[PDB]
Amino acid sequence: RPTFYRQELNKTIWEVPERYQNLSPVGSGAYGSVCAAFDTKTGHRVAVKKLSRPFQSIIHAKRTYRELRLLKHMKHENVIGLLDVFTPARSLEEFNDVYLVTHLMGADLNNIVKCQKLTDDHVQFLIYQILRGLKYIHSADIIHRDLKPSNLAVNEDCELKILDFGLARHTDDEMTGYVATRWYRAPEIMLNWMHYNQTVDIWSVGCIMAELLTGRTLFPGTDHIDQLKLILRLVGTPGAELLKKISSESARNYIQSLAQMPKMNFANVFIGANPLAVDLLEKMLVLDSDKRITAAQALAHAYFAQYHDPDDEPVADPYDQSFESRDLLIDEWKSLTYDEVISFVPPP
Ligand SMILES: Cc1ccc(C(N)=O)cc1
Numbered sequence: 001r002p003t004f005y006r007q008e009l010n011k012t013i014w015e016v017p018e019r020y021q022n023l024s025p026v027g028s029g030a031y032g033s034v035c036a037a038f039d040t041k042t043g044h045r046v047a048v049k050k051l052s053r054p055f056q057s058i059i060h061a062k063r064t065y066r067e068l069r070l071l072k073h074m075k076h077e078n079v080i081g082l083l084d085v086f087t088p089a090r091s092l093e094e095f096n097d098v099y100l101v102t103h104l105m106g107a108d109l110n111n112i113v114k115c116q117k118l119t120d121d122h123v124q125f126l127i128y129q130i131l132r133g134l135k136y137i138h139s140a141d142i143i144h145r146d147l148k149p150s151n152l153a154v155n156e157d158c159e160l161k162i163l164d165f166g167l168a169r170h171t172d173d174e175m176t177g178y179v180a181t182r183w184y185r186a187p188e189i190m191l192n193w194m195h196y197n198q199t200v201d202i203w204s205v206g207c208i209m210a211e212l213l214t215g216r217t218l219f220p221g222t223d224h225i226d227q228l229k230l231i232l233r234l235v236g237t238p239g240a241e242l243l244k245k246i247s248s249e250s251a252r253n254y255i256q257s258l259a260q261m262p263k264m265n266f267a268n269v270f271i272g273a274n275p276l277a278v279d280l281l282e283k284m285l286v287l288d289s290d291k292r293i294t295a296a297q298a299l300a301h302a303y304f305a306q307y308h309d310p311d312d313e314p315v316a317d318p319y320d321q322s323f324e325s326r327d328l329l330i331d332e333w334k335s336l337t338y339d340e341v342i343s344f345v346p347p348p
């Protein structure tokens with residue numbers, strides 16, 4: 001057991017191992033209560049997040065366990081991973097606080113997409129790294145569900161990692177109106193048309209790639225219905241085959257009220273873009289999710305010729321999420337969380 005010391009931070013007393021020095025607040029609270037620190041063991045600048053009294057309800061106790069399982073699983077260059085996890089508690093009986101230690105990624109895609117001139121070669125490398133990460137994530141049967149520029153960390157060398165695992169489900173208020181949180185969502189999840197799957201994440205990659213090429217949001221809707229109209233104007237109204245797959249009868253009736261529209265010509269929308277980037281955008285932004293390109297197929301597309309290495313695009317160990325369908329008491333979720341904390345083995 002390491003030696004711990006105390007100091008006053010973000011309105012509570014933090015108790016952390018001596019290895020973590022020069023703690024000070026960072027971010028706007030998007031990902032929780034977070035300080036930056038210097039890690040004397042690895043030499044990295046790190047983010048330390050404190051979950052205080054997080055076994056306060058069944059929902060919160062299950063969420064805590066979920067975030068710890070997902071972060072412990074993810075071991076990939078283009079994905080956020082767990083450097084360390086700790087509690088100052090000496091036993092289960094006094095266990096109350098969880099601290100997570102992850103790589104400190106200062107800038108996101110939002111802080112360079114607007115304030116910088118991105119060449120075609122920049123767009124190739126950034127989207128390449130998102131798809132390499134996604135291939136890994138999807139091989140574990142994990143769906144991200146929230147890919148957007150603020151969830152992508154980028155350094156001065158244009159190296160990228162994907163964030164946002166096992167946090168609270170976004171609320172109905174968070175998805176209302178003129179908001180970035182909805183602009184990247186696949187239409188089948190934004191309107192609950194059907195049971196969604198990992199294909200929702202490829203729609204999000206399409207919206208991100210378009211924005212890097214044009215400097216503008218692809219579908220900046222003022223509400224769910226305004227956004228749907230922007231989508232259908234680009235990709236066309238649904239045909240008979242997709243309409244059959246929309247389970248909600250009410251959603252199907254609404255769709256059939258709209259005047260039919262053809263798919264637009266993407267070379268006249270993305271004027272001047274690499275024709276290989278136009279072709280890839282057409283394969284991601286397909287309304288029928290069954291027909292979208294997969295992350296694994298997209299990595300082999302000609303647009304990524306100068307980056308693609310099929311011997312360096314790894315897949316994930318299998319990820320058991322049977323806990324997702326399990327009903328437990330607060331103290332049971334808390335005990336499983338304590339076991340995951342004490343069993344943690346750090347990376348090389
Ligand atoms: C600093 C930090 C950032 C992201 C996450 C996460 N659960 O995705 C955790 C911690």
Ligand SMILES: [Cl-]
Nearest residue numbers: 002017018019
């Ligand atoms: Cl220490």
Ligand SMILES: [Cl-]
Nearest residue numbers: 089095096097
């Ligand atoms: Cl504690």
Ligand SMILES: [Cl-]
Nearest residue numbers: 148149150180
């Ligand atoms: Cl964003």
Ligand SMILES: [Cl-]
Nearest residue numbers: 318319320321
């Ligand atoms: Cl597992």
Ligand SMILES: [Mg+2]
Nearest residue numbers: 146164167170
């Ligand atoms: Mg999110």
